[PDB]
Every structure is written in structure tokens, then in C-alpha cells.
Amino acid sequence: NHYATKKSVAESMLDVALFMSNAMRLKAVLEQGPSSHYYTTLVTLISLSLLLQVVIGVLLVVIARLNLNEVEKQWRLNQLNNAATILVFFTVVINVFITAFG
Amino acid sequence: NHYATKKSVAESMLDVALFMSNAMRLKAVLEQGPSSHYYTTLVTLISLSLLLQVVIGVLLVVIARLNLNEVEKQWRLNQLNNAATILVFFTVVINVFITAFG
Amino acid sequence: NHYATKKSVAESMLDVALFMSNAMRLKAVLEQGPSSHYYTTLVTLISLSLLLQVVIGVLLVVIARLNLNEVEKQWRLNQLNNAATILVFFTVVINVFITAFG
Amino acid sequence: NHYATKKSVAESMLDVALFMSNAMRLKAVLEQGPSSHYYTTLVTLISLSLLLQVVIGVLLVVIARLNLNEVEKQWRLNQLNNAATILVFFTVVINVFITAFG
């Protein structure tokens, strides 16, 4: 099998617990109606939270592939590691606001 | 037999367990009627979910053939491996939205 | 899992208990109405308090990465260390004003 | 005079002709009232064009100071030069949308 090997890697670098938790939260607020409180802020907070997770997932794929294969450049890795670390940090910050406003 | 030899390879690089579930779920949503909730979003989510699997399957066929037969080209494998791994990632992401909205 | 590793670092350098407390305080005054006493000063004090934590978190990310990898430069580290310590100092002052005015 | 020397350089890397036009455009839409058509989209489009203009100006300050002063590093300049050009590109793109929706 070859697809199963890819699925494990692609599922290794994504928080399925947090990603799936936000999935129903977007659904629950959507069925609650635009007139409901914090509808406008919760939609954008969740949307960019999931959006940041996708970009995080893509970045983690690049770093993992580039780590062992490439050994010459290290300055590119340092920038990518910082961007991956910082982007994860903003997901932690957003999740608190979702929890606080939820 | 020579066809069974090809059929094993053509089945090894496909998640037939996952592909069949999306196939049956697509059947259910169509028979539930357009008036059913999330009809417009579920069809496109499943459609490109199935589409991404076929594209991944085609990519896996090329990578497997090019692995052992050719060794000089190395960036082409790295681009294809990164494209295959990332394409698998969005199937994982889309599957999450399928379960959440289903 | 790699996102767990990134979540470990991104959460170690954040005052989660205080960040959550300020976020909930901000929601309470917001629902309390602009006519509430000390509305204007409470919002700006909390707002820049949360802003300071985000800036501190990013600075702590840079310092944590640059410590072990970089050894040629130390004057840059000294400036970055002082900015983080002083920025943390102004945070402590704010919650004193927040607690006093709340 | 020294503030004259700084003032000229500060204006050498800013398009005051374009900057001032948006400022009056933001004033016009702000006084026109939220009830005006395309109020929400105009405010965000104009504001982030102004914000992008400031960020470009700060980037140009760094490049000018670093260009003649520094000769060893070259990768940093190319990354800064590119981000300067692409950031200008979005201002051109955004300005077209303000003109179209004006």
C-alpha cells in the first residue's frame, strides 16, 4: 500500500482533535442564525483559525520533507521553523477568543 | 495471469475503504433531494473529494514507476512527492468537513 | 506528531491563565454597555494588555529559537532580552490598574 | 539643518500624491454615512491600502539604510526587495478596486 503511508504522514501533522472540534463549532453558529450574538465575530475567528491550520499543515509538510533530504541550506529552515512556530501561536491565541466568546 | 498483477498495483495505491464510503455517501445525498439541507455544499465537497483521490491515484502510479526504473532525476521526485503528500492532506481536511456537515 | 511539538513550544511561552482571564473580562465589559462606568479606560487598558502579550509571545519565540542556534551575536540577544523583560513589566502594571478599576 | 535632511529622505520614499488622495477619499466615505452603498467594502479597501503604504515606506527605509551600509549579505536584500515590489503590487491592485467602486 502507498496511499495509507501518505495518509499517516498527512494526518501526523494536523491536530485532528482541534481541527474537527472547530468544524462543528462553525456549523453550530451557522444554524444559530445571523441575528444571534457574536455571529459576525465568531464566523471570522473560526474561519481564519481553520485557515491558519491549513497553512500550518502545508508548512509542516515542506519542513519535514526538506529536513533530511537537504543539508546545504540552514537559513531557509530557520525562517520556516519560525513561521511554523509563530503561526501555531496565533492559533492558540484565536482558540482562546473562540472559547471566551463561545 | 498478467491482468491480476496490474490489478494489485492499481488497488494498492487507492484507499478503497475510503473511496467506497464517499461513493455511497454521494448516492445518499442525491436521493435525499435538492431541498435537503446542505445539498449544494455537500455535493461539491464530495465531488472534489472523489476527484482529489483519482488525481492522487494517477500521481502515485507515476511515482512508483519512476522510483526504481530511473535514478538520475531527483528534483522531479521531490516535487512529485511533495505534490502527492500535500494533495493527500486536503483529502483529510475535506473528509473532516464531510463528517461535520453530514 | 509534529503539530503537537509546535503546540508545546507555542503554549509554554504564553501566560494562558492570565490571557484567558483578560479575554473574559473584555467580554463582560463589552456586554455591560458603553454607558457603564470607566468603559473607555477599561477597554483600552485590556486591549493593549492583550496586545502586549501577543508581542511578548512573538519576541519569546525569536529569543527561544535564536539562543541555541546563534552564538556569534550576543548584543542582539541582550537588547531582545531587555525588551521582553520590560514589556512583561508593563503588563504587570496594567492588571494592577485593571484590578483596581474593576 | 538636520530635520530638513531627514524630512527630504522620508518623503523620497513615499508617494504623497497617492497617499493624500486616499486620505480625502476615506474622509468622504466616512462623512457619507454607513447607509451609503458599498460603505463596508470601501472602508476596508481604503484603510488597508493606507496601511500597506505605511508598511512599504518602512521597508524602503530599511533597504536604503542597509543598501550602502551593508555589502556582505545579499539574500536578505533580495527578500526585502521582492517583498517591497509585491507589496506595491497589491496597492496598485487595491487602488483599481477603489476607483472601480468609487
Add this chain to the structure above:
Amino acid sequence: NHYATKKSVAESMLDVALFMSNAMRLKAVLEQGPSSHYYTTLVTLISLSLLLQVVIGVLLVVIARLNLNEVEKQWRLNQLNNAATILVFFTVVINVFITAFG
């Protein structure tokens, strides 16, 4: 001036007459109402028409910068030129349908 040097270069890789035209058509159909004939297909055709040009513009910035500065890497340029030339081709095809459906 230094902003004009970037702005003139960033404008040399855009067809502003072509970009501005599509922006007006998008405004025209939008004010015309969702009930209008071919409202749905016109919105999505124009939306990806504009979106494609931004992607080409970003690629054109990279291509121009990389051409003179770097000379060792050659296969990267051919992929970038192929992506730019093909993406321009799809813009021509899309513009045909918008004219046809308008």
C-alpha cells in the same frame, strides 16, 4: 523618488486596462441582482478571472527579479515561465466566455 521606481516596475507587469475592465463588470452584475440572467456563472467567471491575474502578477515579479540576479538555476525558470504563459492563456479563454455570456 523610490516609491515611483517600485510602482513603475510593478505596473509594467499588469494590464491595468484589462484588470480595470473586469472590475467594472463585476460591479455591474453585482448591482444588477441575483435574479439576473446568468448571475451565478458570471460572478464565478469574473472572480477567478481577477484572481488569476493576481497570481500571474506575483509570478511576474518573481520571474523578473530572478532572471538577471540568478543564472545557475535554469530548470526553475522554465517551470515558472510555463506556469506564467499557461496561466495567461486561461485568462484569455475566460475573457472569451465573459464576453460571450455578457
Add this chain to the structure above:
Amino acid sequence: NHYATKKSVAESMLDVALFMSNAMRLKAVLEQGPSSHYYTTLVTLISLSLLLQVVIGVLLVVIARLNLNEVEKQWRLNQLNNAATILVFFTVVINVFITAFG
């Protein structure tokens, strides 16, 4: 300019008159209703004609780029030229067939 050169190159290798005529014929047939005689055959014929035209354009872009840049390979060029010629043969036959049923 740079987008102008790309648009000229991409427009050289597309028969815009035939594409535009096919698009108008498809639009007219679609407006004429499903009850129209030869509806489904006309729809599928025009759709596959447009698809063949797009594929021909992509192949021509690839051949035009690969001609001067690469000289070591000739058999691939011969295969691509044969495929392009055969595809234009089929699309010409298709337009003849639509003209017959028009």
C-alpha cells in the same frame, strides 16, 4: 511591459475566432431550451470541441517553450507534434459535424 508579451504569445496559438463562434453557438443552444431538437448531441459536441481547443492550446504552449530551449530530445517532440496535429484533425471534424447539425 511584461504581461503584454505573455498575452501576445498566448493569443498567437489560439484560434480566437473559432473559440468565440463555438461559445456563441453554445450560448444560443443553451438559451433555446432542453426541448430543442438535437439538444444533447449539440451540447456534448460543443463541450468536447472547447475542451479539445483548450488541450490543443496547452500542448502548443508546451511545444513552443520546449522547441528552442531543448535540443537533446527529438522523439518526445515528434510525439507531441503528432498528438497536436491529430487533435486539430479531430476538432476540425467536430466543427464540420456541428455545422452539419446546425
